[PDB]
């Protein structure tokens, strides 16, 4: 089997991407944030505290003839941005782009943190990291990809995120028309539950490539590119007037600037992030100070190849017995 679904930016900055997902019978379509940095499929629901729902589409399990309460199961998750959610668990039929999993754990939110309530465009998350990170207790549950893998033509999914435009998540096949050149595959460590790999270095604009190992995660659920402070300083030093602002929470730059590209290594291959991809717009409405899309990871504990990086590539999440990651230009 295969599946293919369009993923659409939620706003003009590509702050996140939503993908329609069919849940239950009859289908209830919710727009979920596909997150390769986490492992829970959770949704706003008829159980969510009413004051914490503000425009989202909700899953109502009582209207699904295939929903079944997973007795005794609860879940609770906290994300790197400080947001969180928790609730109980149903199993139900879940389809993405024509690919159907029966018995998928659908985590129904009873509580969500303010940032979820305040984003009316995201009806939940669909985690695509490794199932070892799934938070369901007392019986950990598998991701949608883990449940579908055996049925897929090939045990892979691909992320093709657009810059200011829709893109595609494919399951079970690699669309050879969706990228240029060849796909360069690189080793993955699953020890932390993530699609964790080592970049071979970087360049800033037209500058020379610096060969240096950068361990990080391929995380479709993080907007920005978070890299070591040395690398990020070298990037922003090429932008007149750029500075790290403690009050804003990262590097800002004059909105009048033209940003240089940023290149990262995948083996001997190179992925070029155009400068425009690094502009996240005024820090507040009407400001001439703009927020940078490359930020220091020094306060995180891990480097994150988020959307800013991944949308410059066609990315293969290879879930073979030994997982690997592939990157192509496009």
Swiss-Prot record:
What would you give as a GO molecular function for this chain, any one?
Answer: aspartic-type endopeptidase activity
Q: Where is the active site?
A: 35, 199
Catalytic reaction annotation: Hydrolysis of proteins with specificity similar to that of pepsin A, prefers hydrophobic residues at P1 and P1', but does not cleave 14-Ala-|-Leu-15 in the B chain of insulin or Z-Glu-Tyr. Clots milk
Query: Any S-S bridges, and between which cysteines?
Result: 255-290
The UniProt record lists the Peptidase A1 domain at: 17-328
Is Protease tagged as a keyword? yes
Q: Which GO terms describe its biological process?
A: proteolysis
What are its E.C. numbers? 3.4.23.22
Q: Which UniProt keywords apply?
A: Aspartyl protease, Disulfide bond, Hydrolase, Protease, Signal, Zymogen
Q: What domain of life does the native source organism fall in?
A: Eukaryota
TM regions (residue ranges): none
Q: Does the keyword Nucleotide-binding apply?
A: no
Q: Which family does it belong to?
A: Belongs to the peptidase A1 family.
Task: Return the protein name.
Answer: Endothiapepsin
What is this protein's gene name? EAPA
In terms of the parent sequence, the fragment covers 90 to 419 of 419
């Amino acid at each position: 089997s295969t599946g293919s679904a369009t993923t659409t930016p939620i706003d003009s900055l590509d702050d996140a991407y939503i993908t329609p997902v069919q849940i239950g019978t009859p289908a209830q379509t919710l727009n979920l944030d596909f997150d390769t940095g986490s492992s829970d499929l959770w949704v706003f629901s008829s159980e969510t505290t009413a004051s914490e729902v503000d425009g989202q589409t909700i899953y109502t399990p009582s209207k699904s003839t295939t929903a079944k309460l997973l007795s005794g199961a609860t879940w609770s998750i906290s994300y790197g941005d400080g947001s969180s959610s928790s609730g109980d668990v149903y199993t139900d039929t879940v389809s993405v782009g024509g690919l159907t999993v029966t018995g998928q754990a659908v985590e129904s939110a009873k509580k969500v943190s303010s940032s979820f309530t305040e984003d009316s465009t995201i009806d939940g998350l669909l985690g695509l990291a490794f199932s070892t990170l799934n938070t369901v207790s007392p019986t950990q549950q598998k991701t949608f990809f883990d449940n579908a893998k055996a049925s897929l033509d090939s045990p892979v999914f691909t992320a093709d995120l657009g810059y200011h435009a829709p893109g595609t998540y494919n399951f079970g096949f690699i669309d050879t028309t969706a990228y240029t050149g060849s796909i360069t595959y690189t080793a993955v460590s699953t020890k932390q539950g993530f699609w964790e790999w080592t970049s071979t270095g970087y360049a800033v604009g037209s500058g020379t490539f610096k060969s240096t190992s950068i361990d990080g995660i391929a995380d479709t659920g993080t907007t920005l590119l978070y890299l070591p402070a040395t690398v990020v300083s070298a990037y922003w030093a090429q932008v007149s007037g750029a500075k790290s602002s403690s009050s804003v929470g990262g590097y800002v730059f004059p909105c009048s600037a033209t940003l240089p590209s940023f290149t990262f290594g995948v083996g001997s291959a190179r992925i070029v992030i155009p400068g425009d991809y690094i502009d996240f717009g005024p820090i507040s409405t009407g400001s001439s100070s703009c927020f940078g899309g490359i930020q220091s990871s020094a306060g995180i504990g891990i480097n994150i190849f988020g959307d800013v990086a991944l949308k410059a590539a066609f990315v293969v999440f290879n879930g073979a017995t030994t997982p690997t990651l592939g990157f192509a230009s496009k």
